[PDB]
Paper text:
To begin characterization of the PRRSV PLP2 domain structure, we determined the crystal structure of the enzyme from PRRSV Type I strain SD01-08. The SD01-08 PLP2 domain crystallized in space group C2221, with 2 copies present in the asymmetric unit. The 2 copies superposed with an RMSD of 0.635 Å over 144 Cα atoms, with unremarkable differences between the structures. Residues 385–415, representing the N-terminus of nsp2 following polyprotein cleavage were not visible in electron density maps. In particular, the α-helical lobe of the PRRSV PLP2 is comprised of a 4-helix bundle as opposed to a 3-helix bundle seen in EAV PLP2. The PRRSV PLP2 active site however is made up of a catalytic dyad formed by C429 and H498 and lacks an obvious third coordinating residue. Additionally, in the apo structure, H498 is positioned away from C429 in a catalytically incompetent conformation. Although unusual, similar active site conformations have been characterized in the OTU DUBs Cezanne, OTULIN, Gumby, OTUB1 and TYMV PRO. Structural regions surrounding the active site of PRRSV PLP2 show a high degree of mobility, as evidenced by higher B-factors in these areas. These regions include the β3-β4 loop (residues 493–499) which contains H498, the 453 loop which extends toward helix α2, an active site loop (residues 422–428) extending towards the catalytic C429, which also forms the oxyanion hole, and the 480 loop situated near the Ub-binding region.
Residue numbers in the entry: 417 to 566
Amino acid sequence: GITTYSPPTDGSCGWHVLAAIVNRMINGDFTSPLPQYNRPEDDWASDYDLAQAIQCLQLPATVVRNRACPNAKYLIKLNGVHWEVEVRSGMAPRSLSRECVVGVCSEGCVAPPYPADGLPKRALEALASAYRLPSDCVSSGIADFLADPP
Ligand SMILES: [Zn+2]
């Protein structure tokens, strides 16, 4: 039993995917609350951008390549050239390693339970502030916010 979120194809798809994961974890609402932001193709969030942001936001998510990490609650995929995200609806979230997050973990990787305090205080505000920055700067943006917000 799986639920897949497909964001509006504004070119900020990648950041809408992360927004949705956070929006589901926090509110049960598996959709992006971020305003649409039309982006040239050159500024589409890359696998590397998403992976760095996952770590800033400390999300139990993976970018899948070949095999999907069996420890990942959220699975970021692209069909065609647009990012989407699946949630394993049951499944308790597990804290993932860099290899799991990046989608290169090998057969029978291991992950511990994700803690109740695992998610940053105001993670979604952080993402809101940063997602209109150039895609490769967004993570730094997110990190900036989480170090001191208003
Ligand atoms: Zn893994």
